[PDB]
Amino acid sequence: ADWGEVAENLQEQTYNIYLTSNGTFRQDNEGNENFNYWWNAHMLDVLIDGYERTGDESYLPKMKSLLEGIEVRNGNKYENVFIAAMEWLGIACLRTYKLTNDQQYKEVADLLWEETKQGWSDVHGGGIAWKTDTPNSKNACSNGPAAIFALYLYEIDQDEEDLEWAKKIYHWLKDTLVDPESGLVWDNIDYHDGEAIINRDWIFTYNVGTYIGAANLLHQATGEGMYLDDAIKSASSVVAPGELTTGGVLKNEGQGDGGLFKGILVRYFTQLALNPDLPDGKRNEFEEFVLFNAETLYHNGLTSAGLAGPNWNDEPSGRVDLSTQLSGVMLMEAKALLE
Ligand SMILES: OC[C@H]1O[C@H](OC[C@H]2O[C@H](OC[C@H]3O[C@H](OC[C@H]4O[C@H](O)[C@@H](O)[C@@H](O)[C@@H]4O)[C@@H](O)[C@@H](O)[C@@H]3O)[C@@H](O)[C@@H](O)[C@@H]2O)[C@@H](O)[C@@H](O)[C@@H]1O
């Protein structure tokens, strides 16, 4: 079984176990049919991964049923009070539009982009708010994805205003939430009792992952070497022993939201690994890091059926949330893409 076949087996198991009403995916493989908007946005990204790997046109109807189901199970609308939810679906919509030219995806993305920009304010000097409800909380997870969103939109529409947005968001993110020594990414800045407080304890895989993804896309959009340097510094900190790994493997971040975090990192990490201006030596290091994570999950973390747990070193003994399964599928599709 080569890495493409492993990826296809995890795509099949995910669809089989989690497919529910309206072509959307359920919260867990046990008693929870809750609709989780951003988790289903990452399921769309996973189906696109399968389509790109296979060229199999049977993915396209699955993608379209999921796009339409999200609107139904979110209450017959695409708006969400969580701004990052709208950013993650926007990214998947523009990715699909680039591959299929299906205008329905572009129209949903255009809507979600207007809502995302409304979240920007000069509180803490910039940044998109986490929620339409929490305008003091500026979070890495509502900024890194907004920069990626703007860069995908720039690739499609070639409007200078979208590149301006990407640069402004990235500049604020790097000036506020990026460790200048490591290039790892702090979770948020918020007010408490008159003080601006940065949460430096919460260093999560997906926040450094979207910073790496934005930096990689900015390098490709501008040619400015500072962006590729930033991406390489952050990625080198992900591979070197430290906060995000245990025994050379991306660490257990629990289930729920945290279950998706590692998958997002692997996706953009892998995109940096495919940048043709990346030095050959760094490319070998990054490709080997992805392979050892993929091998670890395949041999030690996956159940016989092909469900991944939060710990890629251990099989899960009970419930597996969709988020956790998606991280597993994203890892295998990234490995298959590097082959
Ligand atoms: O114990 C808290 C939390 O800790 C870790 O996550 C860190 C994370 O928390 C915050 O954001 C969570 C997500 O918010 C948005 O999704 C909204 C989504 O949340 C749940 O899935 C449900 O309530 C859904 O109904 C709802 O729509 C979005 O921004 C997403 O990207 C976020 O991850 C926030 O403080 C972040 O800055 C921070 O990174 C994990 O252990 C987690 O499982 C845990 O609950």
Numbering used by the authors: 53 to 391
Give me lines lifted from the publication on this model.
Hel_I_6 (Bacteroidota) isolated from seawater off Helgoland island (North Sea) contains an α-mannan inducible gene cluster with a GH76 family endo-α-1,6-mannanase (ShGH76). On overall, ShGH76 exhibited endo-α-1,6-mannanase activity with a preference for linear α-1,6-mannans. The tertiary structures of all three ShGH76 variants indicated a single-domain protein with a classical (α/α)6-barrel fold, with six α-helices forming a core that is surrounded by another six α-helices. Multiple sequence alignment identified the aspartates D136 and D137 as catalytic residues in ShGH76.
Tests with ShGH76Ala showed that it could indeed not hydrolyze Man7. However, ShGH76Ala could still bind yeast α-mannan according to affinity PAGE analysis, whereas dot-blot assays did not show sufficient binding to yeast α-mannan. We hence repeated the dot-blot assays with structurally modified (linear or debranched) yeast α-mannans. Both ShGH76Ala and ShGH76Asn showed binding to linear yeast α-mannan, with ShGH76Ala exhibiting higher affinity than ShGH76Asn, as assessed by blot color intensities. We solved the crystal structures of ShGH76WT (apo-form), ShGH76Asn (with Man3) and ShGH76Ala (with Man4) at 2.0 Å, 1.47 Å and 1.9 Å resolution, respectively. The ShGH76WT protein formed crystals belonging to the I 121 space group (Hermann-Mauguin notation) with three chains in an asymmetric unit (ASU), whereas the mutant protein ShGH76Ala crystallized in the P22121 space group with one chain in an ASU, and the mutant ShGH76Asn crystallized in the P1211 space group with one chain in an ASU. Despite repeated attempts to co-crystallize with Man5, the crystals of the double mutants ShGH76Ala (D136A-D137A) and ShGH76Asn (D136N-D137N) were only obtained with bound Man3 and Man4. The terminal mannose of the Man3 and Man4 ligands adopted a kinked conformation so as to occupy the active site, which has not been shown in GH76 structures. Co-crystallizations with Man3 and Man4 show also a kinked position of the terminal non-reducing mannose residue that is unknown for any other GH76 so far.
